[PDB]
């Protein structure tokens, strides 16, 4: 009687695939099915970007065809949808936050195109980042063998539950040296499900600026922790400000979970959708501050200026324009009142909508800068 992974893999290999993409290059890679009925496969953006055609090949041989659904080069998750899908198998999600260093992991992919290959390992570490400076990364690190083409693959725990998506490895020679990274499930869950509802990743930000907290700062500012998130300035009029986070604060926990580094938290919340609420654990003057927040963005308006009605049927008013915006480049200034556009007397923003919804190549606005009568031109 010998233990084996073949019972767990028998149920899980159907949910991983191989993907092929096609001056013009032809790409290898791996993806994983999220929704059997609709045929959603997730993978890394760096295999399915610049894709003329997307050809998915399941575990059994069946090639299919897929189209793009969303993309997110900042975290490197991209979603495709299989066309005309029949008899698909969806992998079961796992909650990454239950991962611990020392756990066992299985990496399924399509390395070097050879075919669906399985490789075992353990959780080398968690919360790794700093390899791509301008990138959201909260990587799971595994010593499970992973090579070219295994990207967008599956990292599942011993129960076949998806804990993460294999992404990048550190390897000077171009072959795995025992250091393989993966994006956690919980981030993939947040990024994929956003691409289905909205098509893109809408990831507004709360308004903290700041930098990593090093053990040297612990001494200088009487801070009990050596790893966290230090708040330089809070943006004004942002959620971070409204919630009462101040300069000189230290962030220690996200939703009760501790933080590894500012670069990780910067990624965990970079994948959360707009308006998500959360609770941070702060540290001001060595005392625990718990906050509650809500993310914020980065008709009844226009590209650069804000238009509201005024009076009965008289016309819409530009109430403020920010300098440098497109609507300030076209010349609209504070106080202008639009009575007609393209020989069409306008009242409300609704008669202006249908006129604007014609999407004409030119806009002649019969505004009233002060007491005078002028025309303004846009597009």
């Amino acid at each position: 009687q010998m233990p084996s992974l073949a019972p767990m893999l028998e149920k899980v290999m159907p949910s991983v695939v191989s993907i092929n993409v096609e001056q013009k290059f032809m790409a290898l890679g791996s993806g994983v099915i999220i929704d059997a009925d609709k045929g959603y496969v997730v993978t890394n953006n760096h295999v399915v970007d610049n894709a003329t055609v997307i050809k998915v090949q399941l575990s059994d041989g069946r090639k299919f065809d897929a189209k793009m659904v969303g993309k997110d080069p900042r975290s490197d998750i991209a979603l495709i949808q299989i066309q005309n899908p029949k008899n698909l198998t969806a992998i079961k999600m796992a909650d990454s936050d239950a991962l611990r260093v020392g756990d066992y992991t299985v990496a399924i992919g399509n390395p070097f195109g050879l075919g669906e290959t399985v490789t075992s390992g353990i959780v080398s570490a968690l919360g790794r980042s700093g390899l791509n400076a301008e990138n959201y990364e909260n990587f799971i690190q595994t010593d499970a063998a992973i090579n070219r083409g295994n990207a967008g693959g599956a990292l599942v725990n011993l129960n076949g539950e998806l804990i993460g998506i294999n992404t990048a490895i550190l390897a000077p020679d171009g072959g795995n040296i025992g250091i393989g990274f993966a994006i956690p499930s919980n981030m993939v869950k947040n990024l994929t499900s956003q691409m289905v509802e909205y098509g893109q990743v809408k990831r507004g930000e709360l308004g903290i600026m700041g930098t990593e907290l090093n053990s040297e700062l612990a001494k200088a500012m009487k801070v009990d922790a050596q790893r966290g998130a230090f708040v330089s300035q809070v943006l004004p009029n942002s959620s971070a400000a409204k919630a009462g986070i101040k300069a000189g604060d230290v962030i220690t926990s996200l939703n009760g979970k501790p933080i590894s580094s500012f670069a990780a938290l910067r990624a965990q919340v970079g994948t959360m959708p707009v308006g998500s609420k959360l609770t941070l654990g702060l540290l001001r003057d060595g005392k625990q501050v718990n906050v509650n927040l809500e993310l914020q963005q980065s008709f009844n308006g226009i590209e650069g200026a804000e238009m509201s009605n005024k009076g009965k049927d008289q016309g819409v008013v530009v109430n403020n324009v920010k300098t440098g915006t497109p609507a300030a480049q076209i010349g609209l200034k504070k106080g202008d009142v639009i009575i007609g556009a393209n020989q069409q007397a306008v009242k409300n923003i609704a008669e202006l909508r249908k006129v604007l919804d014609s999407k004409p190549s030119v806009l002649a606005l019969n505004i009233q800068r002060g007491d005078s009568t002028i025309y303004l031109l846009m597009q």
């Binding site: 390899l131 992973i146 295994n150 990048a168 490895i169």
Partner: peptide
């Protein structure tokens, strides 16, 4: 010392 996959 910089690589990607």
């Amino acid at each position: 010392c910089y690589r990607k996959l």
